[PDB]
Amino acid sequence: PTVPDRDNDGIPDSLEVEGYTVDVKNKRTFLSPWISNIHEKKGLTKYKSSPEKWSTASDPYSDFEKVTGRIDKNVSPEARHPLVAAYPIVHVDMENIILSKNRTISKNTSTSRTHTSGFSNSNSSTVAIDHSLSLAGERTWAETMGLNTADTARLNANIRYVNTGTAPIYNVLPTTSLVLGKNQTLATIKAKENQLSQILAPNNYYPSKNLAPIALNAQDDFSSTPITMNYNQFLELEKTKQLRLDTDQVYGNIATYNFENGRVRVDTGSNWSEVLPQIQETTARIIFNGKDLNLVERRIAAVNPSDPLETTKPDMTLKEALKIAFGFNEPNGNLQYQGKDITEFDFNFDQQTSQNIKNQLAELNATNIYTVLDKIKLNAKMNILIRDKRFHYDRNNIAVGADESVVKEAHREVINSSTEGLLLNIDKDIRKILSGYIVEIEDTEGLKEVINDRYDMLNISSLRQDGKTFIDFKKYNDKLPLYISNPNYKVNVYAVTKENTIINPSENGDTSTNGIKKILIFSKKGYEI
Amino acid sequence: TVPDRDNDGIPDSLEVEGYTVDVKNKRTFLSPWISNIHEKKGLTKYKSSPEKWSTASDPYSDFEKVTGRIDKNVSPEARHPLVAAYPIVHVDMENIILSKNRTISKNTSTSRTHTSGFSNSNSSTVAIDHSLSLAGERTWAETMGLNTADTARLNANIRYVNTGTAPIYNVLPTTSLVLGKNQTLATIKAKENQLSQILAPNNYYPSKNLAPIALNAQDDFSSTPITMNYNQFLELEKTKQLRLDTDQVYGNIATYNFENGRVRVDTGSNWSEVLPQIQETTARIIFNGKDLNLVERRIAAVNPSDPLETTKPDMTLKEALKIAFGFNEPNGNLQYQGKDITEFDFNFDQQTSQNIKNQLAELNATNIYTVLDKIKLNAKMNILIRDKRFHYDRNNIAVGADESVVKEAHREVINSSTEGLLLNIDKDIRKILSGYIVEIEDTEGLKEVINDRYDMLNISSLRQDGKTFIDFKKYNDKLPLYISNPNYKVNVYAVTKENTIINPSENGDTSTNGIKKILIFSKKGYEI
Amino acid sequence: QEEHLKEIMKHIVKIEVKGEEAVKKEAAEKLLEKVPSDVLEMYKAIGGKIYIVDGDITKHISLEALSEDKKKIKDIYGKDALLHEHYVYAKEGYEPVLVIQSSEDYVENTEKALNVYYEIGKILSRDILSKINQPYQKFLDVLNTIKNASDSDGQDLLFTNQLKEHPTDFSVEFLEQNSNEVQEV
Numbered sequence A: 001p002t003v004p005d006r007d008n009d010g011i012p013d014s015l016e017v018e019g020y021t022v023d024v025k026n027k028r029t030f031l032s033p034w035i036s037n038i039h040e041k042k043g044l045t046k047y048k049s050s051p052e053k054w055s056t057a058s059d060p061y062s063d064f065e066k067v068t069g070r071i072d073k074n075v076s077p078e079a080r081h082p083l084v085a086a087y088p089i090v091h092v093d094m095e096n097i098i099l100s101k102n103r104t105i106s107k108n109t110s111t112s113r114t115h116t117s118g119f120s121n122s123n124s125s126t127v128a129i130d131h132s133l134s135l136a137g138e139r140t141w142a143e144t145m146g147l148n149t150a151d152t153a154r155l156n157a158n159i160r161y162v163n164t165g166t167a168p169i170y171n172v173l174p175t176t177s178l179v180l181g182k183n184q185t186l187a188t189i190k191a192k193e194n195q196l197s198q199i200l201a202p203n204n205y206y207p208s209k210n211l212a213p214i215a216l217n218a219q220d221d222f223s224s225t226p227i228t229m230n231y232n233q234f235l236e237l238e239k240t241k242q243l244r245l246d247t248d249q250v251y252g253n254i255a256t257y258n259f260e261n262g263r264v265r266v267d268t269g270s271n272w273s274e275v276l277p278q279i280q281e282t283t284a285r286i287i288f289n290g291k292d293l294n295l296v297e298r299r300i301a302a303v304n305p306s307d308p309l310e311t312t313k314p315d316m317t318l319k320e321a322l323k324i325a326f327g328f329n330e331p332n333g334n335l336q337y338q339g340k341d342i343t344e345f346d347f348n349f350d351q352q353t354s355q356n357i358k359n360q361l362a363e364l365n366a367t368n369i370y371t372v373l374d375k376i377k378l379n380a381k382m383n384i385l386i387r388d389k390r391f392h393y394d395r396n397n398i399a400v401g402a403d404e405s406v407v408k409e410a411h412r413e414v415i416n417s418s419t420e421g422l423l424l425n426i427d428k429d430i431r432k433i434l435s436g437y438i439v440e441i442e443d444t445e446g447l448k449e450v451i452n453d454r455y456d457m458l459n460i461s462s463l464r465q466d467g468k469t470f471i472d473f474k475k476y477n478d479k480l481p482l483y484i485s486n487p488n489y490k491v492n493v494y495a496v497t498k499e500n501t502i503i504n505p506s507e508n509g510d511t512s513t514n515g516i517k518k519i520l521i522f523s524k525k526g527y528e529i
Numbered sequence B: 001t002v003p004d005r006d007n008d009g010i011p012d013s014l015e016v017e018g019y020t021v022d023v024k025n026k027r028t029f030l031s032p033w034i035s036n037i038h039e040k041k042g043l044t045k046y047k048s049s050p051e052k053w054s055t056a057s058d059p060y061s062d063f064e065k066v067t068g069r070i071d072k073n074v075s076p077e078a079r080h081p082l083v084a085a086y087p088i089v090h091v092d093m094e095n096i097i098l099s100k101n102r103t104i105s106k107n108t109s110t111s112r113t114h115t116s117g118f119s120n121s122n123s124s125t126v127a128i129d130h131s132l133s134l135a136g137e138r139t140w141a142e143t144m145g146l147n148t149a150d151t152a153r154l155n156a157n158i159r160y161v162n163t164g165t166a167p168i169y170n171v172l173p174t175t176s177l178v179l180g181k182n183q184t185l186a187t188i189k190a191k192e193n194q195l196s197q198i199l200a201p202n203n204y205y206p207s208k209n210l211a212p213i214a215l216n217a218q219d220d221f222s223s224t225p226i227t228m229n230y231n232q233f234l235e236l237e238k239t240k241q242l243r244l245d246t247d248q249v250y251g252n253i254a255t256y257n258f259e260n261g262r263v264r265v266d267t268g269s270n271w272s273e274v275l276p277q278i279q280e281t282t283a284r285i286i287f288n289g290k291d292l293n294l295v296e297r298r299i300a301a302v303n304p305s306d307p308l309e310t311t312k313p314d315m316t317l318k319e320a321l322k323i324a325f326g327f328n329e330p331n332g333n334l335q336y337q338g339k340d341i342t343e344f345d346f347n348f349d350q351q352t353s354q355n356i357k358n359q360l361a362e363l364n365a366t367n368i369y370t371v372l373d374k375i376k377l378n379a380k381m382n383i384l385i386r387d388k389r390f391h392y393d394r395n396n397i398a399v400g401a402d403e404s405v406v407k408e409a410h411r412e413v414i415n416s417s418t419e420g421l422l423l424n425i426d427k428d429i430r431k432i433l434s435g436y437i438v439e440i441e442d443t444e445g446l447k448e449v450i451n452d453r454y455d456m457l458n459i460s461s462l463r464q465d466g467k468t469f470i471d472f473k474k475y476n477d478k479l480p481l482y483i484s485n486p487n488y489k490v491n492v493y494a495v496t497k498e499n500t501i502i503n504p505s506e507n508g509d510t511s512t513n514g515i516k517k518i519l520i521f522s523k524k525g526y527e528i
Numbered sequence C: 001q002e003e004h005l006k007e008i009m010k011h012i013v014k015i016e017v018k019g020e021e022a023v024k025k026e027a028a029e030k031l032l033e034k035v036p037s038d039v040l041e042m043y044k045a046i047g048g049k050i051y052i053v054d055g056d057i058t059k060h061i062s063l064e065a066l067s068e069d070k071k072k073i074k075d076i077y078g079k080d081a082l083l084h085e086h087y088v089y090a091k092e093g094y095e096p097v098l099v100i101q102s103s104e105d106y107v108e109n110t111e112k113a114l115n116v117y118y119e120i121g122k123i124l125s126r127d128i129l130s131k132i133n134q135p136y137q138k139f140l141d142v143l144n145t146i147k148n149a150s151d152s153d154g155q156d157l158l159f160t161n162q163l164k165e166h167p168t169d170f171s172v173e174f175l176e177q178n179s180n181e182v183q184e185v
Helices: A013-018 A036-040 A063-068 A231-240 A272-282 A318-326 A351-362 A404-409 B012-017 B035-039 B062-067 B230-239 B271-281 B317-324 B350-361 B403-408 C002-012 C022-033 C037-045 C111-131 C137-147 C154-158 C172-177 C180-184
Strands: A020-025 A028-033 A090-101 A105-113 A124-129 A153-155 A158-163 A176-180 A184-189 A242-247 A253-257 A264-271 A283-288 A296-301 A345-349 A383-388 A391-393 A399-402 A436-441 A461-463 A469-471 A491-496 A519-524 B019-024 B027-032 B089-095 B098-100 B108-113 B123-128 B152-154 B157-162 B175-179 B183-188 B241-246 B252-256 B263-270 B282-287 B295-300 B344-348 B382-387 B390-392 B398-401 B435-441 B447-449 B460-462 B468-470 B489-495 B518-523 C051-053 C072-074 C080-082 C088-091 C097-101
Touching: A013 A020, A013 A028, A028 C002, A090 A124, A090 A242, A176 A231, A184 A231, A253 A272, A264 A272, A264 B263, A264 B271, A272 A283, A283 A318, A296 A318, A345 A351, A351 A383, A383 A391, A399 A404, A404 A519, B012 B019, B012 B027, B019 B062, B035 C154, B089 B123, B089 B241, B175 B230, B252 B271, B263 B271, B271 B282, B271 B295, B282 B317, B295 B317, B344 B350, B382 B390, B398 B403, B403 B518, C037 C111, C088 C111, C097 C111, C111 C180, C137 C154, C137 C172, C172 C180
Parallel strands: A283 A383, B282 B382, C051 C097
Antiparallel strands: A020 A028, A090 A105, A090 A153, A090 A158, A105 A124, A124 A242, A176 A184, A176 A242, A253 A264, A283 A296, A345 A383, A391 A399, A436 A491, A461 A469, A491 A519, B019 B027, B089 B108, B089 B157, B098 B152, B108 B123, B123 B241, B175 B183, B175 B241, B252 B263, B282 B295, B344 B382, B390 B398, B435 B447, B435 B489, B460 B468, B489 B518, C072 C080, C088 C097
16 A cells, blocks of 8 residues: 655654654554544543654754654653654753962852843853852951962862753763953863763753763862963952853764664764754744743654645644643643732743734734634744743843732741741742841831941841741841841831842842841731730 | 564464474474473573563573573573573772882772662672781871871772672773762772673672782872872861772673674673663662672563553562562461561552552552552562661661661570680671670779770681681680689670771760660679 | 565555444354355254344353353363353253354464364364264374374363363273263364
């Protein structure tokens, strides 16, 4: 019969255009054409794909292997669907630094994978240094380090690699350059040779959390102080406490599946540096900060009107994409993510995409995309950013704040209160937009006494091993309990989000919390303790 | 002509239903499992996947494994198709020596480690002997002329241990020594073109008959490669332990060639590409039964989420234990050479835990020991079975036990004299006993402890006939044992590792006063 | 490599869906096909004919009213199974009847077909040949050669316990006195 299959991809043509599905028969797997009534009760997904593309996604794994499972068992589940490109995404995570001069400040850092706006296909991250004073007496770094106008400081950091993509990397590990400010490139981390012999499966660390992080300085003779830095640099650093880590996309080769004997061997001919360009020009990009307020990027295959071959791909409606790319489902026919309705999200579009969607929205005579959601056709190259509508954001699309009303509701559950601290239980996400707390005591006649009355004395909030947050008063106190001038005196507690924080002493070096927009967070009388 | 999709020699139906190969006089043929004719002959009932050239995913085909056309070195228990065959190399440190860039040469004992959120990376742990070989060597800081501005030199001897199930051939793993939380002292070089020998499973390299590989090169690579400023030595004194983390970059793989039966190493296939699959499609079982040492095996379990992967025959936990370790049912009761399955604890990761709480609900049971044979394994669960009788430390190494067990193990006095005891105790106990306290009791309640120093306890040896022999003259005055009264009681206490002290106290007390000691023996003076 | 793709491709991708119930009918017919046709003609001539039910074999008009007591059956492996769970039963009487439970897994596996073929032979030996006493010396002659043979586990394969304990060689009298034992073998 010689059933036609031009794409030479195993599945025959008619099947590919209309819909098929794979189903395990007791112990034997066979491929079948989609029957609407007998498969639906079984929870099987209806796949579609292109009869003229060996890999609709265009990544190196044919349409056939993905649904069948003959593939590196490391490809994330979410990537089995034939319409989601599987490729790696490497960014750099810096855990902590230490400084001295070619009495050494070794301070811990926090990093977030970043994304800013006219945003382009290149990954970069952003580290943020804690500003709080671990030591009381180390006011003014300029003096804690004997830094002179004609001196130079030495930098020695620790970093870890994060794989947030959908595919494994094998041999190489990417080069990435640290830069302060707008254009000041401090250093480019060498590509160590024949040393990253391990694998980065998606959502894994290298080296794992249980091992020493790769020391940034070689500790060898390559450069005595590779991170030299004139005085002026130190100044920018002192005002901003921000560093940029730009990383390129030079990955290794790719691991392919062999039919002859089922061994997965790393082929030295195919190299990710040849495929990514294809992917980035034929797919729709969807950005979501849902899981843990971190930017997860996925790519979906959409049609491109201008190109004959490209109209072949099955039409993809936006709604289903969300269903298959992230895990959205329909408990009641309403798109939702664990309770959170689709309505709790913002839609932002690049100028191109904006233009394209407004047209599509015109022939339908609708104003709320949330209604007509299932009727928006995706074309190649749109860039879509899905951010939580409830939080305020900065220029680099990092979570930075939120509306005050949310802040109170997050605290309406007081599990316990005493004179030694609070043991609260808050949703893991909020404590990513709270920089610290201001504690104050109020005299029966309206006075106000703030205990930790210094800009750099806020890190007083710990977390118990049961996920219960614990605030310690004796930390930035005098290791003494809390005294109260009146069992009728109210005790006020304020919380400070990052956006509303100060990072340097003011003009006259003010350390008081005066010019900080402050929100009241707690107020119980002396006897209610 | 019989279908065969996986193209693995075995036809489809056979793979799904159960088969076994059995030699007819001199010729081997493959046959479907017959219950009555094979059982009396002691053959195992195989199952496998019709769609995996190697159900386990290791580089040996389903067909080859059971028939033996394979590197004759894979340990026996791994010939069964549902048992992953792969290597596991860790490092053992036998003895160290110290000096300053008056030489502290102490014998060491090392252990392969495992901690909890435990990840797929092998690591070990050394423990330094604390007993005082020399009387006068109080305070190492002075036995070695170390000054605040000095540096000490470290010089070790090493050997390699293969506790896995498959051979490594060319490469030998790189491995970095690390002290404390993050102060990496050194990375052990990968000697080049020197491991031309083979490390078969359950063997040492170099073998027990040869000197172990000296760690320092003795060449010009670094004058004193293992330098160590003063500050480390201080930290070293408080913890007296190091960790040695090693990665898994092994060599190539030896494959079987059908044409002439020669086993040749192909330079294309490399273990560093296979391990991720194995580590991601199998169930992990941790067992300390054999010699109180952790033996690791990996078993192939189904993962609902994956079409192809659901093809593998379902494995129930009881059955897993049957093929992986050697448990059997003389009377239908699970036991390992007598020790019933019920004497062990089961601990699970939070992920693994969730799955199992569900599993116990559809059977309406609370004691897992009954419905044990009805629990399905899914991919990526990690299971750890430890002896319920012993106490354990943070790194899941055996460190102690309840005292009550200890005494019956000692209730057998084979002989007693004025020079010591010669017992014959179960080889396993002497891994949770740090030493013994000898004392004499005046008829009026006094107490005289012979070896009354924290670092003077290793006085109990073992004779060549497996009889433990305790020597008094070691830390005595090379003099026999005196007794002031045939009515004076002689008390002996034993001290388990967990209950030991490793350094002098706050005010540098050296007496064994504040040490919890357990009485193990107390006989009359005349009787001895 | 391009060669291999074809063979795997054909086996997994079933081009069209026979249907939900067609497969059942198609499976049974293929099964009976492998038995030599001439056997089927002998069965019809002696009366009753095999009819394939679909549900629980335990509950059918023809079989419900008879042999409730004989709930104990022994499989090919000699293990006892309750009838309700079992998927094929037959009964010997004035109206020789054989009933087979429909299923979709007769081509794919083999353990189920073996029991069916096992049932065809007992009808053949006990109900068909018995009218002519066809099992006789030739069958007895091979039989006798099996008992006396070098450590031949063949015995284990075909003899029950009762037979493995008859000390001397088999005699034409045993078949006469015991004729249930021979027919199973």
